[PDB]
């Protein structure tokens, strides 16, 4: 159990894409007829801190990823299909509006 040095903490916590477990419903809000399995997916999304109240961490470049997801429709059946999700490639701390 080594202690984490300040600059390493600071770099690791600063606004950047991090793997984030995101609910599929949230991304596909027009699909309330389905149950998704898994219900969430691991996506690279901006996170962390800016260390300035006047700034917020926002994406500046995006990309997409495809995953196999089971879609269940109650009282019909299920299938595994390919679903696309947005990822964040680059993040910046930029002024709050």
């Amino acid at each position: 159990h080594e202690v984490v040095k300040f600059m390493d903490v600071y770099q690791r916590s600063y606004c950047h894409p991090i793997e984030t477990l995101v609910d599929i419903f949230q991304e596909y809000p027009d699909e309330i007829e389905y149950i998704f399995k898994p219900s969430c997916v691991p996506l690279m999304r901006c996170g962390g801190c800016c260390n300035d109240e006047g700034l917020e961490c926002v994406p500046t470049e995006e990309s997409n990823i495809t995953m196999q997801i089971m879609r269940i429709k109650p009282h019909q059946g299920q299938h595994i299909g390919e679903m696309s999700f947005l990822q964040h490639n680059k993040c910046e701390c930029r002024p709050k509006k």
Binding site: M7, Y10, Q11, Y14, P17, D52, N89, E92, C93
Partner: protein
């Protein structure tokens, strides 16, 4: 990649010993940390 990474890491090394100085330029450090993350993602 290796060249630009080396340049950025040297810039970080020259700043990091100064963080406790009263007037340290956090915004400069922050912009560099954004460049380092973005370069690692691209590389």
């Amino acid at each position: 990649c290796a060249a630009e990474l080396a340049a950025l890491e040297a810039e970080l090394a020259a700043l990091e010993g100064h963080v406790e100085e009263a007037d340290f330029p956090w915004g400069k450090l922050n912009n560099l940390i954004e460049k380092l993350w973005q370069l690692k993602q691209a590389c």
